């Protein structure tokens, strides 16, 4: 909520991705905290398993509800941190409701 | 421009890409958002930090706000706590 | 300090080009035999694989930690 991105670059979302889709490289932000300089999910590589949703300790990477993101060009499908963070901001209200409904189950 | 200031440059051979199509960058950069967060004052020497919401927050960590000299910062939220 | 990964011999092909990719900055490699590391139980068997497959080999002898004498009483010696 405060506005600090949840990911702390533990990079096990990269470790458990079955398709090798997520690429993460990190460095200590000036704050001294740990953040990802580059987080790239290749959606064409991704097979939407949902393990990344599972693996994240801070639950920073989530499987968002939207399924309609068909794109004219292949490059648009490759997603960097800014698109995903922007995707996160747009759908945060529903993502929060969805995680709210299913967390007891997990 | 972006978080870590990615600046494909005036001479790069990649800045060609944005021609006729905008770049993805972020407003409300996080780098400054927690800095905008007030310091959580506490009474106890040590304090927890569920991240807020328990299961929905982060691994629970106990921070030692023992020295006013430094406001403990949970390595996960970047929240400074003022003893 | 675990030694369970220093048990079996491995033969690894020489490392090759890893140029940065222009569109996303991902590492890109043109060498197919890069990520391949075959594991062989004994030095003799690994040498055999190189000879019949025709790859050049340069075996490195196993170096195991030398026995070291330790005894809690010894350091309590004020003398030394």
């Amino acid at each position: 909520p405060s506005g600090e991105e949840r990911c702390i670059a533990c990079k096990l979302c990269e470790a458990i991705c079955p398709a090798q889709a997520i690429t993460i490289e990190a460095e200590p932000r000036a704050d001294g905290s740990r953040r990802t300089t580059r987080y790239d999910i290749d959606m064409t590589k991704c097979i939407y398993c949902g393990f990344c949703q599972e693996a994240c300790p801070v639950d920073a990477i989530v499987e968002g509800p939207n399924f309609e993101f068909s794109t004219e060009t292949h490059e648009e499908l490759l997603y960097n941190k800014e698109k995903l963070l922007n995707n996160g901001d747009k759908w945060e209200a529903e993502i929060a409701a969805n995680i709210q409904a299913d967390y007891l189950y997990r | 421009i972006t978080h870590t200031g990615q600046v494909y440059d005036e001479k790069d051979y990649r800045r060609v890409r944005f021609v006729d199509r905008q770049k993805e960058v972020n407003e409300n950069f996080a780098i400054d958002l927690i800095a905008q967060q007030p310091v959580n004052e506490v009474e106890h020497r040590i304090i927890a930090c569920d991240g807020g919401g328990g299961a929905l927050g982060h691994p629970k960590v106990y921070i030692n706000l023992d020295k006013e000299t430094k406001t403990g910062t949970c390595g996960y939220c970047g929240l400074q706590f003022k003893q | 300090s675990g030694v369970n990964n220093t048990k079996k011999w491995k033969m690894e092909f020489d490392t090759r080009e890893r140029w940065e990719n222009p569109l996303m900055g991902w590492a890109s490699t043109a060498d197919p035999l890069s990520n391949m590391v075959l594991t062989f139980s004994a030095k003799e068997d690994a040498i055999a694989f190189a000879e019949k497959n025709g790859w050049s080999y340069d075996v490195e002898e196993k170096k195991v930690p030398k026995p070291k004498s330790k005894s809690y009483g010894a350091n309590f010696s004020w003398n030394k």
């Binding site: 300089t37 004219e72 648009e76 698109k83 | - | 900055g25």
Partner: peptide, 24 residues
């Protein structure tokens, strides 16, 4: 309830010596 362009966001990994602009 009552076109993106992908790019690398990391920095230059290997900085390059710049020649001295002072002639010698």
């Amino acid at each position: 309830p009552t076109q993106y362009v992908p790019y690398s966001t990391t920095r230059k990994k290997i900085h390059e010596w710049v020649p001295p602009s002072t002639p010698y």
